[PDB]
Amino acid sequence: VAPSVQQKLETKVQESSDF
Amino acid sequence: YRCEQTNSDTHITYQKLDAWAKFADFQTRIRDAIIKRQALDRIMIGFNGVSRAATSDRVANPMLQDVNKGWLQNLREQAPQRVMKEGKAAAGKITVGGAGADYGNLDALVYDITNHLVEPWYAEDPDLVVVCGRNLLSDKYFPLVNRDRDPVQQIAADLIISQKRIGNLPAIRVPYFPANGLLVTRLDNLSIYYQEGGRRRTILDNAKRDRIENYESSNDAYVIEDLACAAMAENIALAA
Amino acid sequence: GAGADYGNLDALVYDITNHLVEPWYAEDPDLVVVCGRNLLSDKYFPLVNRDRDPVQQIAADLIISQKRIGNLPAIRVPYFPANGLLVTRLDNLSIYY
Amino acid sequence: LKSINFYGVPEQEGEKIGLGVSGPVASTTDTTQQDRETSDISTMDGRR
């Protein structure tokens, strides 16, 4: 029907907390 | 200071675990992310915690204003003269040089705080810094370049933008700081007093509800070591 | 030109960087401002047109030497849209062939 | 164009999904008459 949409996984980086 | 309990808690439904089963490390990665989030969330309370309500409403106070007393609230309770709630003859706020004349730019406001609210023997401490969020610092440097400066002044403005100091004090980027607010203190003056042995970490595989749960009750207390060197301003109506 | 709405282009680049770019990547040293050659020309033009004093002239030459815009290096790129300005580290931009 | 990235993706379509969290996760609840209601914040959204 329609091609499979290949997916990778990005980790959404949060705000840096070195405070 | 009551090192009172905070109920950090995360559940992963079986459905989310199963539907993303192709990514082998999927589960682990969310754990890493949540660990990072938790630490960030920690400091977030430390500045937005206005009170500790018996029940947390994630919709009423999404800033976590009712989970604990952040350092800022301690100022607003103990030694409330440190909290410059309103400026000189303004209307329930601190205006800047846009409206007539009150503290001019932000530099004069932090200077006045440093030499009238911080204790004398700390006002000249080299380690005194100014904690601020993103709106006020960025918008403080903004009128350096928004005024159509001449080339020498543009070189100088770029240098000033490079130097993150507010007034004469080094500035600290801090996420989730209450906008229109400014803290002047030493970073060594701020502390987390958590109860040792208060790590009620537990990992529950709650099949009854079909979710992998994880509890961390943490007894913590956002405490300012000394109020001699912890001043602040609220409602910095930074006119544009 | 009229009022005060992001003043000179450097003020606009500063606001874009510090309000729209992620607050943690706002200071990546490789954050470069991608904009067409003609736009940089039109923003550096006032530095030499408004009849400034000689010491301001040498300062102007120094700035024109620095391709840096706002406070960020500017990448002169052909065929860029007129009256547009992108900002991103040049490793965001990928072509998946 | 020497600075642009060139990746040889072996498929016309596809997505990369960012795995974020929906905000604060830590809160407090008095369990005298309540539960430590646990909430999920893990969100994920993908570019195509």
Residue numbers in the entry:
A (entry chain B): 31 to 49
B (entry chain B): 98 to 337
C (entry chain C): 195 to 291
D (entry chain C): 50 to 97
Reported in the publication:
The ϕRSA1 bacteriophage has been isolated from Ralstonia solanacearum, a gram negative bacteria having a significant economic impact on many important crops. The ϕRSA1 capsid is composed solely of the polymerization of the major capsid protein, gp8, which exhibits the typical “Johnson” fold first characterized in E. coli bacteriophage HK97. As opposed to the latter, the ϕRSA1 mature capsid is not stabilized by covalent crosslinking between its subunits, nor by the addition of a decoration protein. Phage’s capsids are primarily composed of the major capsid protein (MCP), which assembles as hexamers and pentamers called the capsomers that ultimately form a closed icosahedral shell with the portal/connector complex located at one of the capsid’s vertices.
We solved the three-dimensional structure of the ϕRSA1 mature capsid to 3.9 Å resolution by cryo-electron microscopy. The capsid follows an icosahedral symmetry characterized by a triangulation number T = 7, dextro (d) in which the 11 out of the 12 vertices are made of pentamers (the last one is the portal connected to the tail) while the flatter facets are made of hexamers. Accordingly, there are seven unique quasi equivalent subunits of gp8 that composed the asymmetric unit of the ϕRSA1 capsid for a total of 415 subunits in the capsid. The core of the subunit is composed of the Axial (A) and Peripheral (P) domains to which the more flexible N-terminal (N) domain and Extended (E) loop are attached. Whereas the ϕRSA1’s capsid MCP core remains very similar (mean RMSD = 0.94 ± 0.16 Å) between the seven pairs of MCPs of the asymmetric unit, the N domain and the E loop can be displaced by as much as 12 and 20 Å, respectively, between the seven quasi equivalent subunits of the asymmetric unit in order to adapt to different local environments. In total, each MCP interacts with eight others: two are from the same capsomer, while the other six are spread across three different adjacent capsomers. The analysis of the various subunit–subunit interactions reveals that there are five main interfaces which can explain all the intra and inter capsomer’s interactions. The G-loop of ϕRSA1, which is longer than in most phages, acts as a sort of lock for the E-loop. Interestingly, ϕRSA1 doesn’t display either additional densities or any continuous density between the two subunits interacting at the 3-fold axis, which leads to the conclusion that ϕRSA1 uses none of the most common mechanisms to stabilize its capsid at the 3-fold. It follows that ϕRSA1 solely relies on interactions between its MCPs to get a strong enough assembly which can sustain the high pressure inside the capsid caused by the packaging of its genome.
